[PDB]
């Protein structure tokens, strides 16, 4: 008859890969799923140009 | 003509001040709104005893 | 501690800083996981996209 304190996850499954990007001079990128408590996001820098 | 980079808020009003407390030696407290977005929470300690 | 029907007794702060996604001591449907980035890593590729 004990109560739980913390519950850690050791087997996690990812889903719904999505992305949104903007070019260097235009500014920082953003995606609507950043505000969702069930999504993990990351902002990184990638090569961009005429190509 | 420009894009919108970021909007700051300088006048805000709060509502639904809901709190929760557990007695000492029985761990921390929790509320379902601390994981909810558009909310702000703070966990602290308080004088507790028999009274 | 209970994991896959295997049970143990763990020290005070050793259980606090287990580097895994977690949720607090209140169980609801579709729980909110905290620090999910500890199990989902996205680091850089050659260029042009991260995996």
């Amino acid at each position: 008859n004990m109560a739980e304190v913390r519950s850690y996850c050791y087997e996690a499954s990812i889903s719904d890969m999505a992305s949104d990007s903007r070019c260097p001079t235009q500014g920082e990128a953003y995606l609507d799923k950043q505000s969702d408590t069930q999504y993990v996001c990351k902002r990184t820098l990638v090569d961009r140009g005429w190509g | 003509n420009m894009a919108e980079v970021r909007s700051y808020c300088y006048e805000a009003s709060i509502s639904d001040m809901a709190s929760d407390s557990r007695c000492p030696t029985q761990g921390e407290a929790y509320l379902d709104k601390q994981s909810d977005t558009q909310y702000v929470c703070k966990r602290t300690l308080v004088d507790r005893g028999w009274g | 501690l209970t994991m896959n029907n295997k049970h143990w007794l763990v020290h005070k702060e050793w259980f606090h800083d287990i580097p895994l996604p977690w949720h607090a001591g209140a169980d609801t449907g579709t729980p909110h996981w905290n620090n999910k980035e500890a199990l989902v890593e996205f680091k850089d590729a050659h260029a042009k996209r991260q995996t």
Partner: antibody
Amino acid sequence: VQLQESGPGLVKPSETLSLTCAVSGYSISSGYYWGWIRQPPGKGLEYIGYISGSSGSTYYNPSLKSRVTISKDTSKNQFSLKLSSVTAADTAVYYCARRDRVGSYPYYYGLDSWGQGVLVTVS
Amino acid sequence: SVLTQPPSLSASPGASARLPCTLSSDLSVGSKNMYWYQQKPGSAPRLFLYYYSDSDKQLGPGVPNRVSGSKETSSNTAFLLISGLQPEDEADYYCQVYDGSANDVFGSGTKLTVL
């Protein structure tokens, strides 16, 4: 990079539809979300949804809440659509589309590869 | 959420043809990836132009650089500019974007008639 479409041309109301698109020129099990987009005759476009090419997550249109079901099978390199309990307003020309939606190069997010189109009439 | 386009549009060969696509009040056109599709009768709609700004743009495969884009955040409208109207540019143009839940919103469809 070609998309072949299949299904019955004429279907009666209150019956689950059956469309299936064979991907001739690309492997599905690498990414590149695969979607369905229809078009009422003479009017604009109305998308149906899409399914992920790696995980299998399906996402649809707000109006087509529970009437659509997208499946897939990489053995024959195909993906299917089922429109359960069609109505009279569902008479339209259906198109199979593909999109990147993952990674960089935002131009590839738009539907670059389309289908020939299958006319579906309800009566 | 829906995008509005005028039904008819005509211009002489040569001079520019500006094709508008007004976004709804809940959307900001200045921060949305605009997509333009070109559809000729009896054929599949081909992707024509992706436009976010004059420094973030990609035309379709084999499309001449005489097609540009522009955004007007005053009236919250996106544009599809086509200078040098040739007889092969006569088609039906649609706009398309994302939204909060990644739903592709399409436009009314501007039917471009060339003289």
